[PDB]
Symmetry: C2
Subunit: 430 residues, 2 copies
């Protein structure tokens, strides 16, 4: 029933698993370090341990071994709702076990009680100019939340190393609860003239975020519940997850690690694909009309690709099949907005471009990912401010990042210290 007690029971076995990996297989070779990897951003280098999720090359991303369709099947939904609740996903990442309906409701009320945000967090955000990037205002608010960090004081008070995960657990669960309040406050300030909406402790996680953003529609709540769940985690190799794990390895509290993760997530090469697709889709509907045939779209897709241009959300795939996170958002749109013209162009692109990409032979995997479909769903219901979309990404990704940060302290993972070299050193070795 209680998440901290469930984690306490499950920790010792994985600790024993870790010791056996050192004792039995510590010298087992996983690959070779080459000059290509040191200069090419660790490309092809197995470098870190991330337990909460791993990418299956056949079934897509797996949250603790459960694929996206498996998650939709067994994760509890809200009463009067049909999409998997983000609380149940959070339970899965931390414990590895699918939660009951009662455990999700207990976790939902737990999150609602931890969502208190002190006034100096709002003061910190409001002190920034209106021109500040929403990711900057978001990250600055997280830095203000760091003042109430319980792991910082516990470490200063000399808590035992085997107890590090307990205040990390408290800070993470507090962070996960409070980050939507900060994220929605940034949204209301930039677009709703500071007309902030207080948190409702009766609602679940995704619905309370949608409510604080200014969207009380039940279908938007369903959209936000599904959005937070599917963007929650994706290995530890990405910049945001790696950053928080890297800052956390120095025994910084989760607020500092996640705030640093946001600065990495704010990178154009990391957290803007959602915005690139939506802006591109809107310009295509203006250039080619609303009801463009698939064959005229095929000629458009072919000319764009041969002109040296790419189709946003396409070509970036490392899966033999389409990203299951793309498919589930298509299922959502097919049920709740089939007449939306922007989705209709997304749907036609789903049919037309993958064959074109295969015929051109310039790209390995011609299938889209989740970023090719999330824009039209948010835009349809009124969340049109694409520049804010990375803030929504941050709220969801906090669930995966905080889950691994807890096991980093539960497993007692050491400080991350890759060795550095210079071009003089590499040339001297060759």
């Amino acid at each position: 029933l209680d998440l901290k007690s469930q984690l306490q029971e499950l920790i010792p076995e994985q600790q024993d698993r870790l010791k056996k990996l050192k004792s039995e297989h510590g010298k087992v070779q996983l690959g070779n370090i080459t000059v290509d990897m040191v200069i090419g951003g660790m490309r092809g280098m197995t470098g870190l341990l991330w337990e909460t999720s791993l990418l299956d090359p056949e079934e897509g991303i797996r949250f603790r071994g459960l694929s996206i369709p498996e998650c939709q099947k067994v994760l509890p939904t809200a009463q009067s709702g049909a999409e998997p609740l983000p609380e149940g996903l959070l339970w899965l990442l931390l414990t590895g076990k699918v939660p009951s309906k009662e455990q999700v409701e207990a976790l939902s009320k737990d999150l609602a009680n931890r969502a208190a945000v002190p006034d100096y967090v709002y003061n910190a955000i409001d002190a920034l100019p209106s021109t500040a990037h929403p990711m900057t205002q978001f990250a600055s608010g997280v830095m203000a939340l760091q003042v109430q960090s319980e792991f910082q004081k516990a470490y200063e008070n000399g808590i035992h190393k085997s107890k590090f995960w307990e205040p990390t657990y408290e800070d993470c669960l507090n962070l996960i609860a409070r980050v939507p309040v900060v994220a929605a406050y940034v949204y209301r300030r930039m677009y709703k003239n500071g007309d902030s909406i207080p948190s409702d402790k009766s609602l679940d996680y995704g619905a309370n975020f949608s409510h604080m953003l200014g969207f009380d529609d039940e279908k938007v709540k369903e959209l936000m519940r599904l959005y937070i769940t599917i963007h929650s985690d994706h290995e530890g190799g990405n910049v945001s997850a790696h950053t928080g794990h890297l800052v956390g390895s120095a025994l910084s509290d989760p607020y500092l690690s996640f705030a640093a993760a946001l600065n990495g997530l704010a990178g154009p090469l990391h957290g803007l694909a959602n915005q690139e697709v939506l802006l591109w889709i809107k310009s295509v509907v203006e250039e080619c009309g609303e009801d463009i045939s698939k064959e005229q779209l095929k000629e458009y897709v072919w000319k764009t690709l041969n002109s040296g241009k790419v189709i946003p959300g396409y070509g970036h795939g490392v899966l033999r099949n389409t990203d299951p996170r793309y498919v589930c958002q298509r299922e959502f749109a097919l049920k709740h907005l089939p007449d939306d013209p922007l989705f209709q162009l997304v749907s036609k692109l789903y049919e037309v471009v993958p064959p074109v990409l295969t015929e051109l032979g310039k790209v390995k995997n011609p299938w889209p990912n989740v970023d090719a479909h999330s824009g039209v769903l948010l835009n349809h219901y009124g969340l049109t401010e694409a520049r804010y979309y990375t803030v929504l990404f941050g709220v969801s990704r906090s669930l995966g990042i905080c889950s691994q940060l807890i096991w980093d302290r539960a497993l007692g993972l050491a400080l991350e210290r890759p060795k550095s070299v210079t071009m003089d050193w590499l040339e001297a070795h060759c």
Copy 2:
């Protein structure tokens, strides 16, 4: 030529060719092995990233572009009537790889002083936080406020070419380096001097202006800050703060975002508290044993202390067979400017007593101290006693090395950092075959 950006523009194409040739000829050359111990131990022993501004010599210590600290002290220009190397000249060395003239250092000093303008909402952002907030938090939150004026964010939004990424990166870094002391000094005056803020002086050099804004106008403190900023400026890229900024920068985040994230890693107890731990420990030793402790009484204390399962702060943490040259150069300063300071005498006596004791016990590889065992008594002697703030001084200094590499990261067009992640299920499946 007194133009720093033009010097960088001339030197970039050769370094780009060095990288391209390194891939074509030696891209497939093996540098080591990936093992399970390394993946589970935070990439310990794994050569993973490229850091050009410095590299550690196992015999001569850390080298700034191939120049050790004593070598740097000889050729780097100093202030008028002063002996410590100016951080501006060190910054020139890190950026260009060449030792600057006295005039080039002066040109960069006025350049930095002119870029040090800080808008009022940065102070508002910091003051919104409570006074009890950690100094690294108020500093990092202030750095986030400086990010609003980022020129690389706007330049990328306006679609500048990839081959010109370094130009707005250069502007942001020098702007960041110029203003980061202003924010850092404001945090110091706010937390410990009741908000009695001191404005920047455009006549002073970099290290002198920082000491001036912190509230220390004495020439001997300025000399200390010039030496402090210079020797802590950079130290490879494997440490958390340098790696973090490089990691956030690889996603094409501007230097303000990379440095603010770097500070959050630098605030980690395993990264930026060695300076604070040493000063607090020695002050407790002088209180437990009196002010004027003999060298033989310290051996008796150190022997009981080490045999009780305790450690001596600043000692044993060395990866150099000899003493860290950054410790030695600060010992030179203290032997010349404060030999009668009782706290330094304890550090000096520990320098004589502790290395022999540690070797007899055989538990430690290198029994020599590092820079963090000596910087505390220098700051504390002159009035900078707030040890909890010391990591902010570390951050201001380390911005010089981090920003210098961040410019070359875009100059060299280094790609996104994408190490592959695995789980224990995957590792166990890979070991059963």
